[PDB]
Amino acid sequence: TPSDHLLSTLEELVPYDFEKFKFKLQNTSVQKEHSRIPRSQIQRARPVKMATLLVTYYGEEYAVQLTLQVLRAINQRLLAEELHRAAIQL
């Protein structure tokens, strides 16, 4: 599932880089007519937890786009590309 690819993607994501990931996620624009993840939850959310959260709050397709963009925001173009490639496989 998309959440499984997001899990693995953010699992490979270095925790020290995830620190910035979740900081950029807090500053990520909310998708049209979709539910916002509380910043208090984002700070405490695990790399593997956000995979589920983004899907629940925004959606599967939106979770991939959100994570991809935030990865690029933190100079993780590798994971962003691999996530895109995962979306292609899906």
UniProtKB/Swiss-Prot annotation:
It comes from the Eukaryota. Residues 1-89 form the Pyrin domain. This is Pyrin. Homotrimer. Interacts (via the B box-type zinc finger) with PSTPIP1. Interacts (via the B30.2/SPRY domain) with several components of the inflammasome complex, including CASP1 p20 and p10 subunits, CASP5, PYCARD, NLRP1, NLRP2 and NLRP3, as well as with unprocessed IL1B; this interaction may lead to autophagic degradation of these proteins. Component of the AIM2 PANoptosome complex, a multiprotein complex that drives inflammatory cell death (PANoptosis). Interacts with NFKBIA and RELA. Interacts weakly with VASP and ACTR3. Involved in the regulation of innate immunity and the inflammatory response in response to IFNG/IFN-gamma. Organizes autophagic machinery by serving as a platform for the assembly of ULK1, Beclin 1/BECN1, ATG16L1, and ATG8 family members and recognizes specific autophagy targets, thus coordinating target recognition with assembly of the autophagic apparatus and initiation of autophagy. Acts as an autophagy receptor for the degradation of several inflammasome components, including CASP1, NLRP1 and NLRP3, hence preventing excessive IL1B- and IL18-mediated inflammation. The gene is MEFV. Expressed in peripheral blood leukocytes, particularly in mature granulocytes and to a lesser extent in monocytes but not in lymphocytes. Detected in spleen, lung and muscle, probably as a result of leukocyte infiltration in these tissues. Not expressed in thymus, prostate, testis, ovary, small intestine, colon, heart, brain, placenta, liver, kidney, pancreas. Expression detected in several myeloid leukemic, colon cancer, and prostate cancer cell lines. Cleaved by CASP1. The N-terminal cleavage product localizes to the nucleus as a filamentous network and to the cytoplasm, interacts more strongly with RELA and NFKBIA than the full-length protein, enhances the nuclear localization of RELA and induces NFKBIA proteolysis. The C-terminal cleavage product localizes to the cytoplasm. Degraded along with the delivery of its substrates to autolysosomal compartments (at protein level).
